[PDB]
Structure formats: structure tokens, C-alpha cells
Amino acid sequence: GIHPKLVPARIICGCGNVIETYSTKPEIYVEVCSKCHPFYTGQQR
Amino acid sequence: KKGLGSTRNGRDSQAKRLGVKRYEGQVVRAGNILVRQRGTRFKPGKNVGMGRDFTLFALVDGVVEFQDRGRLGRYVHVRPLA
Amino acid sequence: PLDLALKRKYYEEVRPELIRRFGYQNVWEVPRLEKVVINQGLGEAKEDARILEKAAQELALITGQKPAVTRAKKSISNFKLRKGMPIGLRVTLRRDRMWIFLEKLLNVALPRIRDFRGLNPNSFDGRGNYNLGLREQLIFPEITYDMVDALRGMDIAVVTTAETDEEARALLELLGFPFRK
Amino acid sequence: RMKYRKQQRGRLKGATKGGDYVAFGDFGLVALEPAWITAQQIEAARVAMVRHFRRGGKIFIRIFPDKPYTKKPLEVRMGKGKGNVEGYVAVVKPGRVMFEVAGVTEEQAMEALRIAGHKLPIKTKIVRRDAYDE
Amino acid sequence: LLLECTECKRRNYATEKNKRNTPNKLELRKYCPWCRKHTVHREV
Amino acid sequence: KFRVRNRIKRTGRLRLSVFRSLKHIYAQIIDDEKGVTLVSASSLALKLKGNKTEVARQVGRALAEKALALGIKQVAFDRGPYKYHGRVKALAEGAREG
RNA sequence: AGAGCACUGAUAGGGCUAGGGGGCCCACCAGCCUACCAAACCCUGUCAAACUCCGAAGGGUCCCAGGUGGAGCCUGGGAG
RNA sequence: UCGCCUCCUAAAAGGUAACGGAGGCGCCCAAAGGUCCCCUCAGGCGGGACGGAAAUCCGCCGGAGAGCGCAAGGGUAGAAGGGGGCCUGACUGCGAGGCCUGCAAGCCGAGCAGGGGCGAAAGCCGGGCCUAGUGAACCGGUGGUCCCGUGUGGAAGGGC
RNA sequence: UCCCCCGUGCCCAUAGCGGCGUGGAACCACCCGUUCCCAUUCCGAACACGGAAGUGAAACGCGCCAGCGCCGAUGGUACUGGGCGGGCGACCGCCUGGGAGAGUAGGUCGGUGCGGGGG
Ligand SMILES: [Mg+2]
Ligand SMILES: [Mg+2]
Ligand SMILES: [Mg+2]
Ligand SMILES: [Mg+2]
Ligand SMILES: [Mg+2]
Ligand SMILES: [Mg+2]
Ligand SMILES: [Mg+2]
Ligand SMILES: [Mg+2]
Ligand SMILES: [Mg+2]
């Protein structure tokens, strides 16, 4: 290795969820679901 | 009539005898030198060679020749044999 | 490991819709993605010591792999660049490592951008090298706050197998690259 | 200019290559024998042309003083004359097309070049044109 | 800056130079002598 | 790019220029001065199998068999752009061993 | 030597064009014309001891052949 | 100004003078030394958070216009240029043959033995890309040495 | 003996640049994966191993063009040995040998030897 690997799990999208993960820190919540449709997604104004 | 004195432009350096020593078609012995020069203008070929100062010296007894590798430079060789 | 979201969404969708629009003869003509490169326009923290290196222990959180420092040659004295041995943090990432960041680019590291209209539709160099600029960095989800200090922006280039100026612009349009039209 | 300082001389050997042909112009001036034309007869020959016809024509000087003069001031012998006390000169050999102009007939231009031809130490011969273009 | 080196468990010398200010304050390297054959040389 | 082609050309002759491709490995013993090839050992041009490393080790044993009846003994390697590591070692390491 | 502008620098005219000069948009801070000064680049025509993409007549050296000339070589005495 | 280095004057072998025209040296490098391996510039165009004509990046063009410590010239990416590793051959004893040249010098150098470094091996290594960075001889200090050492034995001094 | 492909060597741009078509049977490259040898001042980018899902797009070799680039005569000229003449002057002229430079027509998108594989 020599650096932390790629432990996946869930990145807690704020909306509902996305799995995806790897990166580093597993159980990462993120506030805006960000894709997930929270704004600019299918247009919404 | 009393004027000024001096400049800065009389220095020079003394000669270095820069030349081709033996020429093409000259019998040369062993060790002789063939090219005293600045850099790699003529490059060492068959049975030639150089140390330090780009000095083409015959490794072995023979005849000296020139061939022109256009691109690859100018090459002084040695035809040992006879 | 070898299978991920936009990983699938690449082959399983993006390539085809690219060909019915345009029209490709061979297979190795589709704009697939070859390399993603990251460059830190630093120069600042060059001065002191307590901070300059910490611009690296984090850029392994966005790609799993540690980054790389680089320097210069020319002698510009306009700011303490004597002779030439300064700062230049960069990183490059391929395979899955080039995918997760993408999977984390247009999905979590997006909404929290000041005046987020999308992405630049004018910043095109013809050959598939669209460019942007990342001022803030907390938009990366891992880049929190509880272990940071201040601003450390950077800009990232993108490399394609594309041909035309309009080409990759379309490739972008299906991976998640909104513009302003 | 920028150049660098001063320069040796150069014996005007073969009255030749210092030579041309009436290019962009109607009539022109020629050199019968060589000299070192200076950056002070040129202008003197130039303005002498303009003054013949106010509001008109275009004079095409084709020589330039890119040469240093060198004179010492009353002293003895040491070093090399900084000189330039008259400035710069232009290496002129025969056959060279000194000037050439355009913009009028000949009765209004057989003289403008006849005049300025008197501002030169060397004999001159006005060139009509002769479409011998190479 | 002048310098010369002697060998270990036997004093005998050779020739070279050090530079001091360029942090090089110790100087010991291997070398070939004319008595015995090949060993560690010092300084002083 | 190549250098060591020149590096040997300084010393003696008998270029053993090895070509390695992704599934193929060809090894000659070519002499300059006269500028002519000799033992043209190969495998994808011979008939040997296809396991790469442990296949070069045998073509390496071919030149030995083939050359030692031609008046040959003088090693004079010619690494290409490659790096004396895997197949090039096995190709080699059988040579003098052959 | 000569000649040439492909490197080093120098130069007249024209051209298109980075910058600035006049004049509006009179100011988001950019823009267009221009008998204006100006480099990048091109054509026209050039300058050079310390420029050469080229290049002589001649010059030096080895081989062969003519060449016996107060030629040439070696050793030593003597000088000027 | 006096010694040494680079270009022209130097009239195409060498060399050439002038209180001619222009510039440098009296340093330096334990890595700037050797071996094995990886890589190849300046500049330009166009995109790129800083900065901004010029900061690290990226795509294209880019044959040498960059770099090679310092003046200049020759040379050179088909490396002598930029990184890494292992090393001390900036060894000892010799040294054919030669450039230059009045003497003294200065300079290049294959080949062998003792021993070693690098590399799988071919091979290379007797300092540095080179051309400047230096001082006959006399006198004296320091360390070794089968040496000489005054009637003899030590010693004193000398010698290599 | 010839043609294609591969390794390579010479003559050194009548090989180069750019564009255009072809080539995938074998050839070689792209390409799959980094478990082991090896490795990146991050990274299988490159070096490297294991290999058959895909392809000739890239890169590469082969044929056409002549825009750039290069090669380039004959002719004549500058110049110059050597002998000679004219002007005080800057310079010029004659004869016998040598003979350029650039510019013209023209040529050019290479030629060739060895081995190996496939025709
Ligand atoms: Mg020499
Ligand atoms: Mg030690
Ligand atoms: Mg001893
Ligand atoms: Mg030892
Ligand atoms: Mg001349
Ligand atoms: Mg005879
Ligand atoms: Mg070195
Ligand atoms: Mg350099
Ligand atoms: Mg058939």
C-alpha cells in the first residue's frame, strides 16, 4: 500500500443515498444530496 | 601637446596549434596523434580514439583515411593491415 | 473494485448516445477518458514551514494516492524564486483512481460552489482539454473543516481522445457537465 | 540603432555588387565612381529634392550609413579614435542606385535628381528606368 | 583548501584537498597504498 | 533512444540484437564490419510454445547449440530499448549456459 | 576574396498585426477607423573585421614519378 | 600595461606585429569525480483558483535558437545536458608512440602487473566537455626509508 | 531469383514537413489484468510480468500530390592565380591558367546489403 486503500461503504447523500464510496473515510454523510436531484436536475425553479 | 593615457584592449592569448596533424593517406605508427582540436569536429573512427581534449590518436599502426558521414560528422579512421 | 457507477454509466450508456448523434466507424474513435491531472497553483506557503507540506496529506483522500511536488528552473526574483527550486504540487490518476474522483466530482463536489450556474461553456481549447478553476476546496466532501487551516485552491485539466472542438463538449454533456448555453 | 561601437575600414575593391536597378520608382540616380557617402549629404540631397516640389512625389533613399567614422582630436598616437565626430557613412560603389523617386513627369524630375546629384563628391548618371527587371 | 590523507594502523600519506566551508569536516575514504594493499585512509 | 547499439560498436563486433514484442522474441547474432547476420534464433519464427519468459530461456539455448559449430564463443550482448530484466535475462542466462 | 540572409545584429518601403497617439461608445473595461509612432511575420531591395546555408584561385602535408642540384641528411671545428 | 584564456586584425596549413578593435583568469566541485540505469530543452499558440507580459499544469507546434559553474570560441540531445543507485581510478609501479617547441617546459596517450569500484556481461575508471584558474632552481618544516653516518658503538646531521 | 512484414546496417533530406488512400491471414502496435520479478521523486504514463474479450482508431509500414523544404546543371558573371599595362589620387584595364555565389530549366514524398517469417 504505503497509503490507505479504498474501503467502500456508503456516502450518505442528504436526499436519500448513494453507495459508490471508496475514497477514504467510509460512513461519510454529506449534506446536500448534491446529485440526487437537489437543484439543477430536471430543472426546478 | 600633452594628452591622455590608456584604454583596455591590448590583452591577448598565445597560440594553441589547432590543426589536423597526420592527413589522409599518411602512414602513421602506434600512439601517434592525428587531430588536435576544440570539441568533436572530426570524430574518432576505426582504430582511433580520444582522451580529455578531443585528441585523435591511432590505436594501431596503419594508414589514415577520411570518410564523411554527412549527418554523423567527420570521421578519421585507421587502416591497419598494410 | 473493478466496477463502479459512472464506470458502468460510461460504457453502458454514454458511448452509444455519442455515436447515434455523431457517427463513428471504428471503436477506438469514441472519446474515452485517458488521464486526469491536478495542479496546485501555490507559491504562497513556499515561505514558512508549518503549513506548506499539509497540502498533500489531504489530496490522497480524493484519489487514494499521494501527490507529487515539483519545481522550476528560470531565475525569477520577483518573489523569492532564487535560481529555481520552488513549490509545485501535482497529482495524476488513472483507472478506478481516475474514476472515483469523477464519481465524486459531479455528484458531491458540486452544489456548494459560489454562484453555481454549471460549468464554463466557453473555456474550450478545441482539443479535448476543457479547463476550470477550483477556488474553494470544502466542496470536496472529505475536505471538512475539523482538520484544515485556510485556502488551498487548484485547477484541473482533462484529457480526451477527441478530435473536434465540439466533440468532447458533447461527451461532457452526458457525464454531468452542465453549461450556460 | 544599437550595433556595437566601431569598425575597421574596407578598401572599395571591385566597383560592383554595391549595385542595383530601379525597383520601386520611376527614375533613379547612379554612381560613376565609389566613395563613402555620409549621413549628412543624404539628408542634404533628400531635402534638396523635396524643396524643388512642395507637396508632391516620394523619394526613395536606398543607402544607409551603417559604418563608423573615426577621427582623433589634434593629439598624437594612442588607442583608436573614438571619432564619429561626423557620425556615420554608407559604403558606396559604382553601379549602385543611390536614390530613385516617383510622382511627377521628367521636366519636374529631370532636375530634382540633377540637383541632389550635385550634393555628391562622385559623378552621377540619372537612370530613366529601362524595364530590364530581374 | 589543502589536505592530505594517511591510512589506518600505519602512517603513510597521499595527496588531495578539502574545502571546509562546504560542510565537509571529517574526510575519510579508501585508497590504494604502495605498502600493504588497499585499506582505509584518513587525514591530518 | 538506443545508445548501447553504439556502446558495443566501440568494442569488438558480434552484435546480439534482441527484439522483444508482446508475444514474440527474436534473437540474432549479427556482425558489423561485414554487416551481415548469422545465427537467427527465434521462437515465434521457430516453433516454440507461448509462455514468454520460460520460452526465451530456450531460444537462448539455441544459438549456443547452433553457433558453437560455426566458430563462435565471444559474447557481445545488445540490449535494445529493453532493460536487462525478465525475458532478456532468461534469453541471455541460457546463452553461455548453453 | 566573392556572394548570400538560413544563424548574429543593422536598414528603406509596403503589407497584415501585439501596444500606445487623435476621435466616440464619454466610462462595465473592453471595442472600430486612423496621411501617427511601433516590434512579431511576409514580399520588394539591401549592410558587416569579430554573421556564414555556400565557396575559390591559391596554401600545407603523405604516396608515386621526373628531377645530380654546391639537393637534401648526420657528426664535429669555427664564426658572424 | 608586464603572466595566462576566447574571437577578429591573421591576407582559407601552423604562426604573425602595432599605446589596434572587443571580452576573461589567479577561482572552484565529495559531488560538478567514476560505473550502471531513467529522462531530453528554450520559445510559441490555446485553455487553466492564486500571481500574472512571465510561478506549478495540460493539448498541440517546437532539431537546438535552452542547458553544459564563471569571458569567448569550438563542440554537443545518436549527451558532454537534467535525476537515482553503488563507489574513490583526484590509485601505485611503469609506460610504446607522438602534438608544440631554441632550452626548460607544457600536452595526449594505447599496453602490462598489484589491488579495487561499477555493471548480469561487452566494457569503462590513471579527475571534471575542452581550451585559462599558475612558479625553474636555492633555503628551510612535517611523515616514512634495506641508506651514509668520520677509530668503534649509540647519538647529531645528511640522503631517497 | 522476385513481393509483403519484422529485426537491422550502410549512402546521409532527390529519405524531411503536410495532406490524401491502403494494410490486420502472419507480422507489430494499440488493448485486458496488475497475482508474482521490476517500477513511478503521485500514477502499470513509461520499464515489467501474465495474456486473448476488442481493434487497426492511434502509433507504424506501403502507394499518390508538390504547397513548404531540399537537390540543382549548362550558360554568363564577380573573384583569382601568374605575366603586363593606365591614372599621383580613390581605382581600372589586357592576356593564360583556374573557375564561383546566388538566380533559371529541371529533380525530388528515397536507394541498398544481411538474416528471419509469410507469400
Ligand atoms: Mg584537440
Ligand atoms: Mg568510510
Ligand atoms: Mg610505509
Ligand atoms: Mg583498497
Ligand atoms: Mg567581403
Ligand atoms: Mg623522386
Ligand atoms: Mg559529469
Ligand atoms: Mg547545459
Ligand atoms: Mg503464392
UniProtKB/Swiss-Prot annotation, chain A:
Residues the entry annotates as binding Zn(2+): C13, C15, C33, C36
Lineage: superkingdom: Bacteria
Protein name from the UniProt record: Large ribosomal subunit protein bL31
Sorted UniProt keywords: Metal-binding, Ribonucleoprotein, Ribosomal protein, RNA-binding, rRNA-binding, Zinc
Annotated family: Belongs to the bacterial ribosomal protein bL31 family. Type A subfamily.
MF terms (GO), sorted A to Z: metal ion binding; rRNA binding; structural constituent of ribosome
Function of the molecule: Binds the 23S rRNA.
Keyword match rRNA-binding: yes
Cofactors named for this entry: Zn(2+)
A GO BP entry: translation
Cofactor note: Binds 1 zinc ion per subunit.
Subunit description: Part of the 50S ribosomal subunit.
Cellular component terms (Gene Ontology): ribonucleoprotein complex; ribosome
From Swiss-Prot, chain B:
Keywords: Ribonucleoprotein, Ribosomal protein
Matching Pfam families: Ribosomal_L27
Any one annotated GO CC term: cytosolic large ribosomal subunit
One GO MF term: structural constituent of ribosome
Kinase recorded as keyword: no
PROSITE patterns to which the protein is assigned, alphabetical: RIBOSOMAL_L27 (PS00831)
InterPro entries associated with the record: Ribosomal_bL27, Ribosomal_bL27_CS
UniProt-listed SUPFAM superfamilies: Ribosomal L27 protein-like
Region Disordered: start-end pairs: 1-18
Domain of life (superkingdom): Bacteria
One of the GO BP terms on file: translation
Position of the signal peptide: none
Role of this protein: Found on the solvent side of the large subunit.
Recorded family membership: Belongs to the bacterial ribosomal protein bL27 family.
Subunit details: Part of the 50S ribosomal subunit.
Matches recorded under NCBIfam families: L27
Name of this chain's protein: Large ribosomal subunit protein bL27
Organism: Thermus thermophilus (strain ATCC 27634 / DSM 579 / HB8)
Gene this chain is encoded by: rpmA
UniProtKB/Swiss-Prot annotation, chain C:
PROSITE patterns (UniProt xref): RIBOSOMAL_L5
The UniProt record lists the keyword Metal-binding: no
InterPro entries per the UniProt record, alphabetical: Ribosomal_uL5 (IPR002132), Ribosomal_uL5_bac-type (IPR020930), Ribosomal_uL5_C (IPR031309), Ribosomal_uL5_CS (IPR020929), Ribosomal_uL5_dom_sf (IPR022803), Ribosomal_uL5_N (IPR031310)
Keywords from the UniProt entry: Ribonucleoprotein, Ribosomal protein, RNA-binding, rRNA-binding, tRNA-binding
Top-level taxon in the UniProt lineage: Bacteria
GO cellular component, one term: ribosome
HAMAP family for this protein: Ribosomal_uL5_B
Family: Belongs to the universal ribosomal protein uL5 family.
Cited function: This is one of the proteins that bind and probably mediate the attachment of the 5S RNA into the large ribosomal subunit, where it forms part of the central protuberance. In the 70S ribosome it contacts protein S13 of the 30S subunit (bridge B1b), connecting the 2 subunits; this bridge is implicated in subunit movement. Contacts the P site tRNA; the 5S rRNA and some of its associated proteins might help stabilize positioning of ribosome-bound tRNAs.
Protein name: Large ribosomal subunit protein uL5
Organism, scientific name: Thermus thermophilus (strain ATCC BAA-163 / DSM 7039 / HB27)
Top-level taxonomy: Bacteria, Thermotogati, Deinococcota, Deinococci, Thermales
Swiss-Prot record, chain E:
Entry's Gene Ontology BP terms: translation
Molecular function terms from GO: structural constituent of ribosome
Tagged with keyword Repressor: no
GO cellular component: cytoplasm; ribonucleoprotein complex; ribosome
Keywords assigned: Ribonucleoprotein, Ribosomal protein
Source domain of life: Bacteria
N-terminal signal peptide: none
UniProt keyword Ribonucleoprotein, yes or no: yes
Family: Belongs to the bacterial ribosomal protein bL33 family.
Descriptive protein name: Large ribosomal subunit protein bL33
UniProt gene name: rpmG
Residues of the full protein shown: 9 to 52 of 54
